[PDB]
């Protein structure tokens, strides 16, 4: 029954963001720790995303893109769209349509340096850590910032696994 | 039928969670006579038998308590040596009480520590290419199922030889692992599991797996 | 049952003999260090199964199976070790490896005056006998139990 | 989903544990966050469930909150709402389902209180904004219960209204 309301989680997250900003005036630290907790969630979250689909780690990067894409539909019940691949064809752009945590939560223009929902941008980080595929991942257009629809840019950097599943570590 | 020892190990391999099912280790009793057919060979505080196995006695089987006197190391609780009573024939016949040395917690920790690189280095240059480490081991009296979550976590549960569909049990313990690690980020990703919630829900799982039927996946 | 490869190690732990028919991935390390790594593999496996078993290990370890291949083991009461390796689908190969041991290795190693225990076994006759004996019922696979 | 909320809330709790050096005012942080969420939970759930209708009767408003907040937050309305006759300021709302243990929780050896306090703070904010300021304490009595302590002023206004 989805056992949650988008509003409910939105309230919890907004209150938490309020809490950090009340803790540290500088948005730099709130961004740091929010990406830290995004990493933290993304490590355990993949343990459930792989509890349903037993996809092989990475045959190709488009497989990773579709995996992370379906992840949000599993959790946040939104379908992102993958596009804008390089001639190198390793990176990509990913579109989040509607963000439950965002829904009518305005941000102070005196707080612009904050990356509000970057937890997801870090969750995939924490996710991509686990499968031994670290990634330079972040946003190029933010529906939060005033852009039309959310758009995160994924630059994969390097692998951590050999012909054995154990891989380098 | 039961899942003997449900365990799990970190990337380093320290046994995270020694979930022991109820496992009655066999206890043997016998009233012996003048110096023994049994090989009462002393080996590092383990007064056991290597040769001359009788009456369902194994190599591990070690004296626990003659006439209900538990052994401390090699000596009697009253302070006499095992062989001190062995040379003495007046008390004979005397009741010896043998049990296989029950793996304590630190023992199982060392066992998992010594095991881990085995699976980790499991024929790294195996004849077949692109292969994995050991996925299933099958032994004389048990079968170990190890399941790597493609990185990090290794669910290692040992079940009966003839048991089937253990992979689904691994799936459910994967689920309950997630349901636990929900709560404590201060629970480090390599700290041992100490939580009674996981304990009781896995006791429910054991009660279920008393029944073979796993459906709506049974927990 | 056609298989990937077979290993024969003395109780001391040296490479008595190796045989290959299907081993596809050709390693980079030397097959000598590979043989020693397999022997440590096997002995530590034997310790593991001996100690974590809740009940008496009569013959101890049996085999392991992986995602893509599988490995089977044979402990002689002499302490000799046989190990075979292949893909998945066949009759259980415990009696297969026993038949190979009794019918070939006993026949064409021990019975040879040239064969001196504590050394390697180098003979084209035994290589033949082993080859055609695996080629006796040589379809494929293991699924050993 | 459930894993996302359960985890993410867990990081609220433990990050507070980071900024907090002891049990009790850690629990106070949990209470404060429960307040900061209930402070809008209240008037959201007002319109969509109470049909935008105010309940001056402490019993009726409290019962309706008991149904609504639990029905939408955690699905199952709390089992029982009781009023203690010895102390009309102090009533109980027992919820056998632990909302902390929905995400099965920490050993309560190093600590005592949990997300129970967070939902207690939610209840307290709902009460104090409904015009019934109160103290809501999570208690491991008969499992999870929330003891509610009404201000003598508020319960006095109630008693005067309970003079028909």
XYZ file of C-alpha atoms in Angstrom:
697
model
C 0.000 0.000 0.000
C 3.156 2.104 -0.398
C 2.836 2.600 3.385
C 3.889 6.247 3.077
C 2.684 9.616 1.857
C 4.801 11.776 -0.435
C 3.818 14.675 1.799
C 4.897 12.754 4.916
C 8.417 12.018 3.682
C 8.563 15.549 2.280
C 7.814 16.956 5.740
C 10.435 14.777 7.403
C 13.135 15.714 4.893
C 12.279 19.413 4.937
C 12.365 19.419 8.727
C 15.761 17.708 8.647
C 17.085 20.311 6.191
C 15.755 23.018 8.496
C 17.592 21.214 11.284
C 20.999 21.269 9.601
C 20.629 24.894 8.539
C 19.795 25.672 12.159
C 22.913 23.688 13.093
C 25.480 25.077 10.638
C 24.884 28.501 9.123
C 27.200 27.669 6.231
C 25.446 25.758 3.463
C 28.777 24.165 2.552
C 28.613 21.842 5.549
C 24.947 21.044 5.070
C 25.744 20.032 1.490
C 28.709 17.976 2.706
C 26.749 16.096 5.350
C 23.685 15.727 3.137
C 25.834 14.040 0.509
C 27.398 12.051 3.349
C 23.992 10.718 4.388
C 23.126 10.209 0.720
C 26.195 7.991 0.496
C 25.021 6.331 3.725
C 21.549 5.576 2.423
C 22.765 4.586 -1.031
C 24.954 1.887 0.440
C 22.054 0.126 2.203
C 19.469 1.047 -0.462
C 21.247 -1.006 -3.114
C 20.925 -3.956 -0.714
C 17.175 -3.794 -1.346
C 17.272 -2.708 -4.989
C 19.191 -5.935 -5.580
C 16.726 -7.804 -3.356
C 14.228 -7.677 -6.250
C 16.225 -7.581 -9.511
C 19.345 -9.766 -9.665
C 20.912 -7.769 -12.480
C 24.586 -8.476 -13.248
C 26.832 -5.735 -11.885
C 27.614 -3.946 -15.159
C 27.711 -5.442 -18.616
C 27.543 -1.852 -19.892
C 26.868 1.594 -18.488
C 23.413 1.832 -20.043
C 22.531 -1.131 -17.835
C 23.614 0.948 -14.833
C 21.575 3.882 -16.119
C 18.433 1.776 -16.444
C 19.047 0.191 -13.035
C 19.322 3.550 -11.275
C 16.370 4.712 -13.381
C 14.071 1.914 -12.230
C 15.337 2.367 -8.664
C 13.483 5.666 -8.239
C 10.288 4.174 -9.655
C 10.682 1.409 -7.075
C 11.141 3.855 -4.189
C 9.990 7.344 -5.201
C 7.505 6.029 -7.793
C 8.829 8.308 -10.543
C 10.263 7.294 -13.902
C 13.437 9.176 -14.859
C 14.511 9.457 -18.480
C 18.017 8.605 -19.690
C 19.521 10.540 -22.596
C 22.403 12.769 -23.702
C 25.257 10.304 -24.009
C 28.732 11.428 -25.015
C 30.552 10.422 -28.173
C 32.588 8.636 -25.518
C 29.167 7.139 -24.640
C 30.059 6.487 -20.992
C 28.369 9.462 -19.301
C 24.676 10.336 -19.510
C 21.972 12.760 -18.387
C 19.045 11.625 -16.237
C 15.699 13.393 -15.855
C 13.718 13.294 -12.620
C 10.162 14.390 -13.410
C 8.602 15.057 -9.991
C 10.376 14.849 -6.649
C 8.199 13.928 -3.636
C 10.635 15.621 -1.260
C 10.474 18.791 -3.365
C 6.716 19.157 -3.721
C 6.079 22.824 -2.892
C 9.119 23.233 -0.648
C 10.614 26.605 -1.565
C 14.230 27.458 -0.929
C 15.647 30.749 0.365
C 17.555 32.683 -2.306
C 19.874 33.537 0.614
C 20.541 29.812 0.611
C 21.190 29.163 -3.089
C 24.538 27.386 -2.672
C 22.644 24.527 -1.037
C 21.987 21.505 -3.219
C 18.698 20.460 -1.683
C 17.891 16.983 -3.017
C 21.515 16.070 -3.795
C 20.955 13.175 -1.380
C 19.642 11.262 -4.387
C 22.655 12.552 -6.313
C 24.651 11.037 -3.461
C 22.443 7.984 -3.029
C 23.413 6.801 -6.499
C 26.953 7.674 -5.431
C 26.512 5.443 -2.399
C 24.768 2.972 -4.674
C 27.494 3.173 -7.308
C 30.123 2.737 -4.609
C 28.706 -0.601 -3.585
C 28.760 -2.334 -6.978
C 32.404 -1.217 -7.220
C 31.647 1.489 -9.806
C 32.466 4.850 -8.260
C 30.992 7.772 -10.168
C 31.375 11.524 -10.498
C 27.651 12.320 -10.455
C 25.806 15.611 -9.930
C 23.207 17.939 -11.440
C 23.387 20.122 -14.520
C 19.821 21.468 -14.324
C 17.740 21.662 -11.155
C 13.968 21.958 -11.065
C 14.661 23.163 -7.524
C 16.821 26.020 -8.815
C 14.132 27.182 -11.240
C 14.707 24.827 -14.136
C 11.869 23.023 -15.886
C 12.449 19.373 -14.918
C 15.232 17.863 -12.826
C 18.359 16.784 -14.718
C 21.406 15.080 -13.113
C 24.664 14.457 -15.032
C 26.470 11.146 -14.544
C 30.177 10.883 -15.379
C 31.397 7.365 -14.610
C 35.083 7.391 -13.723
C 36.557 3.941 -13.155
C 35.900 0.323 -12.213
C 36.941 -1.719 -9.187
C 36.312 -5.327 -10.283
C 38.257 -8.029 -12.131
C 37.051 -11.178 -13.922
C 36.188 -12.391 -10.392
C 33.197 -10.965 -8.464
C 35.502 -10.284 -5.504
C 37.341 -7.618 -7.501
C 40.016 -5.188 -6.371
C 39.472 -3.842 -2.859
C 15.928 -30.059 7.969
C 16.925 -27.136 10.159
C 19.416 -24.464 9.132
C 22.235 -25.332 11.507
C 24.240 -22.125 11.684
C 23.139 -18.969 9.899
C 26.143 -16.676 9.638
C 27.348 -13.621 7.715
C 30.743 -11.960 7.211
C 31.970 -8.516 6.201
C 34.301 -7.692 3.317
C 37.234 -8.241 5.672
C 35.425 -11.439 6.667
C 34.922 -11.192 10.431
C 31.888 -13.309 11.304
C 29.268 -10.618 11.788
C 26.383 -12.651 13.193
C 26.583 -16.158 14.681
C 22.915 -16.994 14.361
C 22.876 -20.495 15.803
C 19.733 -22.501 15.400
C 18.906 -24.865 18.225
C 21.532 -27.537 17.569
C 21.673 -30.352 20.142
C 25.238 -31.619 20.008
C 25.339 -35.326 20.811
C 26.312 -36.207 24.384
C 27.628 -39.696 25.121
C 28.048 -41.502 28.429
C 29.916 -44.653 29.363
C 31.060 -46.310 32.595
C 34.604 -47.397 31.808
C 37.009 -49.788 33.548
C 40.776 -50.253 34.145
C 43.044 -48.259 31.800
C 41.224 -47.725 28.636
C 40.905 -48.991 25.097
C 40.019 -45.393 24.258
C 42.974 -43.314 23.111
C 43.190 -40.951 26.080
C 45.781 -38.853 24.256
C 46.193 -35.395 25.775
C 46.316 -32.550 23.232
C 46.558 -28.947 24.482
C 43.949 -28.913 27.264
C 41.674 -31.067 25.060
C 41.663 -34.516 26.663
C 40.139 -36.259 23.660
C 40.417 -39.455 21.611
C 41.928 -39.700 18.143
C 41.864 -43.476 17.549
C 39.698 -46.366 18.825
C 36.258 -44.914 18.116
C 33.410 -46.815 19.788
C 29.748 -46.219 20.619
C 29.285 -43.218 18.351
C 32.351 -41.421 19.701
C 34.154 -39.067 17.324
C 37.681 -37.682 17.319
C 36.479 -34.348 18.670
C 34.452 -35.974 21.456
C 36.071 -34.773 24.669
C 35.377 -35.613 28.294
C 33.181 -32.965 29.906
C 32.577 -34.140 33.479
C 33.414 -37.477 35.070
C 30.550 -38.248 37.480
C 29.482 -34.629 37.015
C 32.874 -33.024 37.699
C 33.498 -30.551 34.843
C 37.061 -30.429 33.535
C 39.022 -27.189 33.754
C 41.608 -27.426 31.001
C 43.151 -30.819 31.747
C 42.607 -31.078 35.516
C 39.691 -32.131 37.660
C 37.561 -29.357 39.088
C 38.719 -30.695 42.456
C 42.211 -30.220 41.026
C 43.463 -33.715 40.140
C 44.646 -34.444 36.613
C 42.622 -36.539 34.189
C 45.459 -39.072 34.045
C 45.689 -38.830 37.835
C 42.311 -40.555 37.922
C 43.319 -42.651 34.907
C 46.128 -44.358 36.824
C 43.843 -44.896 39.839
C 41.882 -48.169 39.487
C 40.045 -48.185 42.840
C 37.269 -45.822 41.722
C 36.733 -47.955 38.629
C 34.313 -48.456 37.111
C 33.977 -44.688 36.561
C 31.505 -42.807 34.370
C 33.063 -40.769 31.565
C 30.951 -38.126 29.821
C 32.028 -37.276 26.266
C 30.893 -34.454 24.014
C 32.293 -33.040 20.816
C 33.943 -29.685 21.619
C 31.158 -27.170 21.104
C 32.341 -24.273 18.962
C 32.276 -21.234 21.225
C 31.800 -17.721 19.877
C 35.494 -16.895 19.458
C 36.020 -20.314 17.879
C 33.403 -19.558 15.224
C 34.929 -16.100 14.740
C 38.318 -17.678 14.035
C 36.669 -20.271 11.786
C 35.047 -17.579 9.655
C 38.245 -15.509 9.614
C 40.291 -18.469 8.369
C 37.527 -19.461 5.935
C 36.874 -16.086 4.296
C 39.901 -15.900 1.937
C 39.115 -19.449 0.788
C 35.867 -18.271 -0.801
C 37.502 -14.939 -1.651
C 40.424 -16.611 -3.461
C 38.324 -19.571 -4.615
C 40.241 -20.780 -7.674
C 40.825 -17.204 -8.789
C 42.501 -18.664 -11.868
C 39.816 -21.323 -12.293
C 39.728 -23.405 -15.494
C 36.386 -21.921 -16.509
C 36.623 -18.161 -17.183
C 34.630 -15.225 -15.802
C 33.591 -17.491 -12.936
C 32.741 -16.649 -9.334
C 33.960 -17.758 -5.952
C 32.457 -20.768 -4.211
C 28.687 -20.422 -4.424
C 27.632 -23.697 -2.777
C 29.696 -26.153 -0.753
C 28.284 -29.585 -0.005
C 29.793 -31.757 2.711
C 29.291 -35.146 4.317
C 26.596 -34.053 6.790
C 25.750 -30.471 5.765
C 25.657 -28.091 2.822
C 26.858 -24.496 3.083
C 25.205 -21.879 0.883
C 27.249 -18.698 0.493
C 25.640 -15.841 -1.419
C 27.559 -12.668 -2.239
C 25.361 -9.636 -2.879
C 27.611 -8.942 -5.892
C 29.793 -6.992 -3.425
C 30.227 -6.743 0.332
C 27.779 -9.019 2.127
C 28.131 -12.812 2.125
C 25.138 -14.704 3.514
C 26.473 -18.070 4.678
C 23.924 -20.575 5.985
C 24.528 -24.280 6.545
C 21.572 -26.606 6.003
C 20.889 -30.316 5.675
C 22.388 -32.225 2.743
C 19.063 -33.128 1.137
C 17.534 -29.682 1.631
C 16.407 -27.758 -1.449
C 15.624 -24.166 -2.357
C 18.076 -22.677 0.145
C 18.573 -19.722 -2.221
C 15.099 -18.526 -1.227
C 16.097 -18.657 2.441
C 19.101 -16.542 1.492
C 16.690 -14.142 -0.207
C 14.577 -13.820 2.935
C 17.577 -13.315 5.210
C 18.752 -10.674 2.727
C 15.354 -9.008 3.169
C 15.533 -9.155 6.958
C 19.121 -7.907 6.836
C 17.848 -4.821 5.030
C 14.936 -4.562 7.483
C 17.499 -4.475 10.286
C 20.167 -2.190 8.812
C 17.301 0.245 8.345
C 17.881 1.711 11.790
C 21.531 2.241 12.835
C 24.111 3.986 10.666
C 26.147 4.053 13.889
C 25.913 0.320 13.541
C 28.956 0.204 11.310
C 28.819 -1.825 8.114
C 31.361 -4.148 9.748
C 30.203 -4.289 13.356
C 28.878 -7.639 14.617
C 25.099 -7.984 14.663
C 23.780 -7.455 18.203
C 20.019 -6.882 18.013
C 17.212 -8.984 19.444
C 14.774 -7.882 16.727
C 16.701 -9.733 14.027
C 16.981 -12.580 16.525
C 13.245 -12.970 17.095
C 12.224 -12.517 13.466
C 14.775 -15.164 12.529
C 13.357 -17.409 15.244
C 10.046 -16.945 13.442
C 11.825 -17.874 10.209
C 13.203 -21.003 11.892
C 9.724 -21.928 13.125
C 8.551 -21.563 9.533
C 11.386 -23.595 8.017
C 10.442 -26.360 10.415
C 7.816 -26.640 7.673
C 9.359 -27.207 4.251
C 6.771 -25.131 2.374
C 8.074 -21.659 1.542
C 5.252 -19.584 0.061
C 4.303 -15.867 0.005
C 7.784 -15.981 0.879
C 7.447 -17.553 4.272
C 8.879 -15.759 7.297
C 31.427 -37.253 -18.995
C 33.750 -34.757 -20.673
C 35.287 -32.364 -18.143
C 37.567 -29.338 -17.885
C 40.607 -30.685 -16.035
C 41.913 -33.081 -13.383
C 44.503 -32.743 -10.608
C 46.340 -35.471 -8.677
C 48.282 -34.578 -5.528
C 50.081 -36.821 -3.061
C 49.244 -36.747 0.640
C 52.469 -34.788 1.169
C 51.136 -32.114 -1.176
C 53.114 -32.246 -4.393
C 51.692 -32.260 -7.912
C 51.674 -35.948 -8.768
C 49.987 -35.302 -12.104
C 47.835 -32.840 -13.998
C 45.532 -33.488 -16.941
C 43.698 -31.052 -19.206
C 41.000 -31.592 -21.817
C 38.717 -28.538 -21.772
C 40.323 -25.879 -19.573
C 39.462 -22.747 -21.531
C 40.790 -19.844 -19.458
C 44.568 -20.244 -19.562
C 46.048 -18.718 -16.424
C 48.940 -16.309 -16.202
C 50.525 -17.690 -13.049
C 52.417 -20.957 -13.339
C 50.457 -24.177 -12.983
C 52.863 -25.148 -10.193
C 51.879 -22.284 -7.913
C 48.373 -22.961 -9.215
C 48.662 -26.558 -8.008
C 49.875 -25.417 -4.598
C 47.047 -22.882 -4.375
C 44.561 -25.641 -5.186
C 46.104 -27.877 -2.530
C 45.764 -25.157 0.098
C 42.252 -24.589 -1.237
C 41.431 -28.246 -0.615
C 43.087 -28.703 2.778
C 41.557 -25.575 4.284
C 38.205 -26.676 2.829
C 38.658 -30.019 4.576
C 39.349 -28.234 7.864
C 36.303 -26.000 7.371
C 33.920 -28.874 6.659
C 35.423 -30.967 9.465
C 34.972 -28.315 12.115
C 31.770 -26.458 11.191
C 29.860 -29.696 10.590
C 27.408 -30.482 13.422
C 27.749 -34.234 12.767
C 30.529 -36.748 12.232
C 32.400 -36.153 8.951
C 32.938 -39.662 7.619
C 34.609 -38.717 4.327
C 34.487 -34.980 4.934
C 34.257 -32.609 2.009
C 32.523 -33.593 -1.233
C 32.589 -30.789 -3.822
C 31.840 -27.156 -4.511
C 29.733 -25.609 -7.256
C 30.002 -22.093 -8.655
C 28.039 -19.870 -10.996
C 29.744 -21.153 -14.120
C 31.777 -24.277 -13.342
C 32.007 -26.852 -10.581
C 34.759 -28.732 -8.759
C 34.694 -32.267 -7.356
C 37.000 -33.909 -4.832
C 38.177 -37.379 -3.836
C 40.095 -38.265 -0.666
C 41.750 -41.654 -0.649
C 42.312 -43.374 2.699
C 45.898 -43.411 1.434
C 45.833 -39.611 1.637
C 45.986 -39.238 -2.141
C 43.860 -36.413 -3.545
C 42.000 -36.342 -6.860
C 40.161 -33.232 -8.041
C 38.126 -32.810 -11.207
C 36.609 -29.692 -12.727
C 33.944 -29.092 -15.367
C 30.584 -27.539 -16.271
C 27.246 -28.385 -14.731
C 25.071 -31.098 -16.269
C 25.769 -34.814 -15.702
C 25.416 -37.806 -13.407
C 26.990 -37.299 -10.004
C 30.696 -37.864 -10.522
C 31.783 -39.302 -7.169
C 31.605 -42.841 -8.528
C 32.997 -41.465 -11.798
C 36.166 -40.254 -10.096
C 36.336 -43.481 -8.077
C 36.072 -45.530 -11.276
C 38.819 -43.412 -12.829
C 41.000 -43.927 -9.750
C 40.566 -47.697 -9.578
C 40.494 -48.465 -13.298
C 43.231 -46.121 -14.582
C 45.429 -44.493 -11.948
C 45.801 -47.680 -9.910
C 46.184 -49.661 -13.134
C 48.688 -47.404 -14.896
C 50.621 -45.634 -12.142
C 51.041 -47.913 -9.133
C 51.596 -51.008 -11.256
C 54.468 -49.276 -13.118
C 57.966 -50.161 -11.877
C 59.150 -46.862 -13.355
C 56.665 -45.119 -11.066
C 58.318 -44.228 -7.759
C 55.998 -42.634 -5.156
C 57.114 -39.242 -3.933
C 57.779 -38.091 -7.510
C 55.775 -36.833 -10.470
C 54.026 -39.251 -12.830
C 55.315 -38.696 -16.380
C 54.245 -41.379 -18.857
C 52.534 -41.147 -22.232
C 50.843 -44.484 -21.517
C 49.040 -43.117 -18.470
C 48.198 -39.924 -20.345
C 46.583 -42.083 -23.021
C 44.705 -44.358 -20.616
C 43.393 -41.343 -18.697
C 42.398 -39.573 -21.916
C 40.446 -42.431 -23.471
C 38.947 -43.320 -20.093
C 37.497 -39.845 -19.697
C 36.496 -40.235 -23.365
C 34.723 -43.496 -22.462
C 31.381 -41.862 -21.622
C 32.423 -38.339 -22.518
C 29.384 -36.102 -22.996
C 29.869 -33.277 -20.442
C 28.964 -31.620 -17.136
C 28.956 -32.560 -13.463
C 26.165 -31.493 -11.061
C 28.006 -33.609 -8.493
C 26.463 -34.254 -5.078
C 7.936 2.816 -0.152
C 9.022 1.845 3.347
C 12.774 1.238 3.279
C 13.518 4.774 2.091
C 11.510 6.449 4.848
C 12.637 4.028 7.561
C 16.305 4.480 6.692
C 16.215 8.223 6.014
C 14.498 8.779 9.361
C 17.164 6.563 10.932
C 19.824 8.951 9.633
C 17.928 11.856 11.181
C 18.041 9.967 14.468
C 21.706 9.011 14.323
C 22.885 12.362 12.980
C 21.208 13.872 16.008
C 23.103 11.223 17.984
C 26.200 12.697 16.344
C 25.352 16.237 17.460
C 24.170 14.901 20.859
C 26.412 13.575 23.629
C 23.794 11.781 25.750
C 20.444 9.966 25.764
C 17.872 12.417 27.168
C 18.330 15.473 24.988
C 18.870 13.202 22.020
C 15.319 12.129 22.785
C 14.533 15.838 23.058
C 15.809 16.338 19.503
C 13.554 13.496 18.385
C 10.656 15.256 20.114
C 11.513 18.569 18.451
C 11.555 16.989 14.995
C 8.254 15.250 15.683
C 6.903 18.679 16.591
C 8.272 20.279 13.436
C 6.507 17.665 11.321
C 3.217 17.601 13.225
C 3.071 21.402 13.068
C 1.799 20.928 9.530
C 0.560 17.303 9.729
C -2.222 18.749 11.873
C -3.775 21.105 9.390
C -3.052 18.940 6.389
C -5.030 16.075 7.884
C -7.672 18.538 9.093
C -9.202 19.199 5.679
C -8.755 15.847 3.958
C -10.120 13.721 6.827
C -11.896 15.885 9.425
C -13.749 17.512 6.491
C -12.420 20.853 7.761
C -14.321 20.469 11.032
C -13.068 21.400 14.501
C -13.676 19.161 17.527
C -13.775 21.162 20.755
C -14.441 17.961 22.714
C -11.053 16.673 23.826
C -12.374 13.128 23.487
C -13.621 13.606 19.938
C -10.614 15.520 18.621
C -8.201 13.118 20.321
C -10.024 10.051 18.997
C -10.187 11.492 15.491
C -6.468 12.313 15.573
C -5.873 8.759 16.797
C -7.700 7.421 13.764
C -6.385 9.856 11.168
C -2.703 10.422 11.902
C -2.045 6.719 12.297
C -4.256 5.763 9.333
C -2.277 7.928 6.947
C 1.187 7.953 8.560
C 1.536 4.289 9.521
C -1.661 2.776 8.122
C -3.058 1.193 11.281
C -4.904 3.462 13.693
C -3.635 3.057 17.242
C -5.391 0.325 19.198
C -6.765 2.165 22.169
C -7.415 5.608 23.607
C -8.076 5.740 27.348
C -8.664 8.431 29.946
C -7.358 7.931 33.474
C -10.030 8.813 36.030
C -7.550 9.528 38.843
C -5.903 12.346 36.850
C -8.105 13.961 34.211
C -5.024 15.823 32.980
C -3.276 12.513 32.215
C -4.695 10.138 29.588
C -3.105 7.393 27.481
C -2.979 6.425 23.817
C -1.628 2.887 23.451
C -0.296 1.899 20.022
C 0.795 -1.727 20.044
C 2.569 -1.239 16.703
C 5.938 0.416 17.363
C 6.649 2.937 14.651
C 10.290 2.891 15.681
C 10.372 -0.919 15.480
C 8.708 -0.847 12.080
C 12.369 -0.230 11.281
C 13.586 -2.747 13.850
C 15.567 -0.678 16.284
C 18.693 -0.448 18.449
C 19.278 -2.428 21.648
C 17.887 -0.313 24.480
C 20.817 -0.999 26.768
C 22.936 2.062 25.969
C 19.723 4.035 25.411
C 16.115 4.119 26.550
C 13.839 6.074 24.200
C 13.464 6.071 20.428
C 11.406 7.208 17.417
C 8.548 6.548 19.811
C 9.536 9.963 21.159
C 9.457 11.385 17.632
C 5.860 10.328 17.041
C 5.106 11.463 20.593
C 6.359 14.901 19.611
C 4.116 14.704 16.560
C 1.178 14.003 18.875
C 2.245 16.838 21.168
C 2.418 19.351 18.312
C -1.011 18.223 17.098
C -2.400 18.700 20.599
C -0.781 22.079 21.192
C -1.933 23.463 17.853
C -5.439 22.024 18.218
C -5.837 24.337 21.205
C -5.047 21.532 23.672
C -1.426 22.024 24.749
C -0.109 18.882 26.364
C 2.957 16.846 27.233
C 3.278 13.605 25.267
C 5.773 11.052 26.572
C 6.673 7.804 24.872
C 6.465 4.987 27.410
C 7.382 1.317 27.140
C 4.323 0.461 29.233
C 2.255 -2.374 27.774
C 4.461 -1.951 24.746
C 4.336 1.441 23.066
C 2.053 3.969 24.724
C 1.961 7.762 24.710
C 1.056 9.343 28.019
C -0.608 12.719 27.502
C -0.609 15.293 30.302
C -3.046 18.163 29.841
C -2.374 21.599 31.235
C -4.575 22.296 34.238
C -5.721 25.343 32.274
C -6.689 23.235 29.253
C -8.326 20.433 31.235
C -10.034 23.132 33.307
C -11.500 24.751 30.200
C -12.572 21.232 29.227
C -14.195 20.504 32.601
C -16.040 23.818 32.463
C -17.254 22.876 28.991
C -18.116 19.499 30.496
C -20.746 21.300 32.587
C -23.769 21.029 30.311
